[PDB]
Amino acid sequence: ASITSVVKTSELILKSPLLSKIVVPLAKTYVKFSGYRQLGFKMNDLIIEETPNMQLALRRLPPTESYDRVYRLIRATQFSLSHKLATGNDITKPEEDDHYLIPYILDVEAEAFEKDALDNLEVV
Template structure:
């Protein structure tokens, strides 16, 4: 599985290139529109798999209000799913509300994990 860091770097590369952004951005917007997660009240970051150790640590670092909002969105979407209904128009996530609230925390956790791995594999060479 790709790390969030590699996904962010790839997206930055695509957005810097005029040709790639002209092709990929409309496709991404169409994909998001038809994926349907906004019709259940989710934000994009609510869909990231949370069973990984890095994600667990990032979720623990969320501010309490953001963590509460996330859990509320998950419970509300579960209710909509169980009743086989979509969210009412007032509860549908609008594109401007769909921010990446969790990505900065995940990037910090991954940077710390990469640094820890580099330090754990460090070889000390004795000088003569």
């Protein structure tokens, strides 16, 4: 599934008061149990990147954000192989779990989906 899909659907939920009231607490618990923060990941580090679109989004990251992503992945790989969890400052605090990549992939995909749409346009 595309990140665009996921983001638009999430926005539909956050709009509806009823929906957000029941879903936002679920999703926050889900994320706590997911436990990716315990390896010092940001949510966006876990998005599948072996795709044309994502490779392009990752090339668009500012050098700073890109270097830090590499570090978090290296560090998480090291936690994984040691079967340890992050401790202290390595644990991702909720305030640090920023969607650094979502804007870039949404732009990549916006263009890719526009391209598909316009490839199928019919002059009227």
